[PDB]
Design a binder for this molecule. Sequence first.
Ligand SMILES: Cc1cn([C@H]2C[C@H](O)[C@@H](COP(=O)(O)OP(=O)(O)O)O2)c(=O)[nH]c1=O
Ligand SMILES: [Cl-]
Ligand SMILES: [Cl-]
Ligand SMILES: [Cl-]
Ligand SMILES: [Cl-]
Ligand SMILES: [Cl-]
Length: 391
Amino acid sequence: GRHMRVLFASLGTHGHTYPLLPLATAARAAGHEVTFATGEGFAGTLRKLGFEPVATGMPVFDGFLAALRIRFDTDSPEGLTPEQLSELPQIVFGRVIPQRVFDELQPVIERLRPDLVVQEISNYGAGLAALKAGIPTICHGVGRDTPDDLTRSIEEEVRGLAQRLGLDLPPGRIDGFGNPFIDIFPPSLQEPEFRARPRRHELRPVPFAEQGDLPAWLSSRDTARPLVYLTLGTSSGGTVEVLRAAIDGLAGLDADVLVASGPSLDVSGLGEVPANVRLESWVPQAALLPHVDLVVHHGGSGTTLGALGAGVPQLSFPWAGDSFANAQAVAQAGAGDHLLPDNISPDSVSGAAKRLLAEESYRAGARAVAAEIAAMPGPDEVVRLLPGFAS
Ligand SMILES: Cc1cn([C@H]2C[C@H](O)[C@@H](COP(=O)(O)OP(=O)(O)O)O2)c(=O)[nH]c1=O
Ligand SMILES: [Cl-]
Ligand SMILES: [Cl-]
Ligand SMILES: [Cl-]
Ligand SMILES: [Cl-]
Ligand SMILES: [Cl-]
């Protein structure tokens, strides 16, 4: 089991791709040849890590357009109730993307002959492609198990797809296609049923280490003041309305506020902001978090786990994806708090943030999880299992 060809495959967003990079880096360091399938935009990052990049997936727009046609036989959302529209994500993620990824990986697997596939949990198409070609596979988590309505709906679409592809799946949860599962969620905060799953292996949720520079103003800021970091992710985890509300609620505090708006959020008409607020487009989050006193965010898994890993209290605005499951876990740990979508006002943000900074129990809760995260097996230890997985 030396010099294996290992194919990693994730959905093409930062949140779905970054969590797999540490295991992939450890794999290469162990002497394996890493091919990494995800969005085309990650090619540069992947090459820098010494991986061979493969481009999979499609633009967000094309995904929802296909879902719209499939479900409602129309090209336009207009005239559709928000309830009807809420029927689309399960089709986008359980049917349309997996079909595309399954098809794209056919040629790749054929020519590469990988010894092992590492499939990111939400990238169902890659698991089907590996099943089809009979390649040993393991499933790599990105966050907490989420036994919620949306995931069950997505999984129903996946089973439907597998059946159409002539691939037999058991009834019931997809469960990583029954493969060994690499779980990066702090065990105490993981769903109890998932935590007891056979063939589950812990892996420390290492944040993505990028050699980028931190903003210069940080080096001369008055560190007697708290530093607050506000972000809404990279995948439409929030609206400009939410952002402005958060900025105005946080700007009041006696604190410095670093805002990272992300690539897919245009705030071009955001308005002027107080002097203690510094707007960045993108930052090396991993490198930043250890210097921060409060993380305010939409509740994405990467940022949730980064704040927990750094022992920093967090305030989230859970809205989409697994954000409610994260809020729940953070609440459980006493490591932060959240505001529901109806209760996001400068006043509500201000009060919550003041509380999270003043009450020492939140930092305590967060630091407890940081300790649990540090004791989890590191990529170099976990990577030693790959040969076994490929047998
Ligand atoms: C917006 C932003 C994100 N990121 C990174 C941090 C996370 O690993 C990832 C965001 O993932 P995550 O926090 O899971 O949110 P979502 O998936 O809902 O977008 O992007 C930055 O490094 N800098 C930034 O400015
Ligand atoms: Cl290739
Ligand atoms: Cl060979
Ligand atoms: Cl096993
Ligand atoms: Cl560095
Ligand atoms: Cl998803």
